[PDB]
């Protein structure tokens, strides 16, 4: 349920003189978060609206920076942008009826190329985080500063007074700046620990308070896909001084990894008391060698061309992306579930299988009237597959296929129809299998493969005599025989399912096949 990125509009209560036009409180909520679609991290709908609204000059965007809020060494982010984007344009409607003071903008986080590949060991990510509060009348946090508002405005992190930003302080390699974030991730444990800090500018003679770093939060999360869900723990849960709105925790912490190898990550959370909404983004340090592995497979087989086109995935099998917009693969008002179930949702139309599979979905899709064949699924990584030492698995499932020369023929998944048996022998890693067509005696495709990592690779060939496109009508039965390279992966919790595909172009006969099966014996 977690998407590309999110943005919450920076709260500005209607601080008007009061013929009942004055807004008492401009609170925050989960419904005040708005979702961001595909594109570049440093640009989206509302931000473009800001750019249009901009005009003469002056756009404030939290990049880095290099003036406030950065960690040196964990410098440039290519896949992720998280922070604040606002404008100093106040809203005035003496033409009735509006009065808005403070930053007109959004607190967002956005990433591109969701990770289908993650490290297999402990990796630390450093970065930054930013917050914003609601707009309550006569609400001020002395610890944050009056310049931060919180009356009329909503206490923006970019305006927190007693923080270090300018880098002139300690001209050496002083690393952390402003509100920094630190994370340690154990991918083998599927666990994420974190801490949201606050770098203090130790006053010239250190006047009234305060030491180097104020621990604002900690973070506890777990993985399931390429995203992470969990809780944010406020360090000052015992607070009543009213010095800062970091009193309550947050059971609404969501996030995700970005980059092909998962070299970046970003997320958000909203405090339980609906007082503080916060975002964060972190990457690794500056011929790198982090041991990695694939966790998510998600591709379309173009129709026809040749190869496969990789498509974005969040680990949610129940829906897919077409590079543009979301496509739900669940039956609604049509009644679940049978085996296969096709759906159309405005932009395109598709058919998805099946019911016996929970960790993977595969089928066909259409828009250009040249159908492609998608396959997606969350793999079963990785030491679980490696440690497995059985003797014979015997997977069983089915497949979507298309063979043409011409003449052209296609086959769909069945519940005597299209079937697919697979024999997996661990310890030796050797796997064999066959997939058969509709009402036909002999196997259509024989697949021989072997297991590496959390996947399997091999070859699929037709019968010795070939595969007749027209078994009946003997003259030009079109015995098209095809030998191609088939690649697949193990999807599930205990590798209870498997999937894969193979395609083939030529300088005259073409083909494309996707398949999925379930472990039983
Ligand atoms: Cs404080
Ligand atoms: Cs204010
Ligand atoms: Cs200051
Ligand atoms: Cs709480």
Residue numbers in the entry: 43 to 328, 335 to 463, 466 to 557, 563 to 576
Give verbatim lines from the article.
Neisseria meningitidis is highly adapted to its human host and acquires necessary iron in the host environment using specialized receptor systems that sequester iron from circulating host glycoproteins; notably transferrin (Tf). TbpA functions as a TonB-dependent conduit allowing iron transport through the outer membrane. TbpB extends from the outer membrane surface by virtue of an N-terminal peptide region that is anchored to the outer membrane by fatty acyl chains on the N-terminal cysteine and is involved in the initial capture of iron-loaded Tf. The current study was initiated to explore the sequence and structural diversity of the TbpB and TbpA proteins to gain insights into the covariation and coevolutionary correlations between the TbpA proteins partnered with each TbpB isotype.
The overall approach was to develop structural models for TbpB and TbpA from strain B16B6 to compare to known structures of Tbps from strains with isotype II TbpBs and use this insight to provide a structural context for exploring the sequence diversity of the receptor from of a large collection of N. meningitidis isolates. The overall structural organization was similar, consisting of two orthogonally oriented lobes comprised of N-terminal handle and C-terminal barrel domains. In contrast to the isotype II TbpBs, the loop regions of the handle and barrel domains of the N-terminal lobe were fully resolved in the B16B6 TbpB structure. Similarly, there was only one unresolved loop region in the C-lobe of the B16B6 TbpB compared to four in the type II TbpB structures. Although much of the core secondary structural elements of both isotypes are nearly superimposable, there are subtle differences in loop regions and a tilt of a helix in the N-lobe handle domain. The primary differences between the TbpB isotypes are present in the unresolved regions of the crystal structure where there is poor electron density in the maps found in the linker region between lobes, and loop regions of the C-lobe (dotted regions – extended description in Supplementary Section). The residues comprising the anchoring peptide that attaches to the outer membrane are not resolved in any of the structures. As revealed by the structural study with the B16B6 TbpB, the most distinct differences between the isotype I and isotype II TbpBs is in the linker region and the C-lobe region where the large loops are reduced or absent in the isotype I TbpB. Isotype I variants also possess longer anchor peptides and shorter linker regions than their isotype II counterparts. The anchor peptide is observed in a locked conformation bound to the C-terminal amino acids of the C-lobe via an antiparallel B strand exchange, while the remaining anchor peptide wraps around the C-lobe domain.
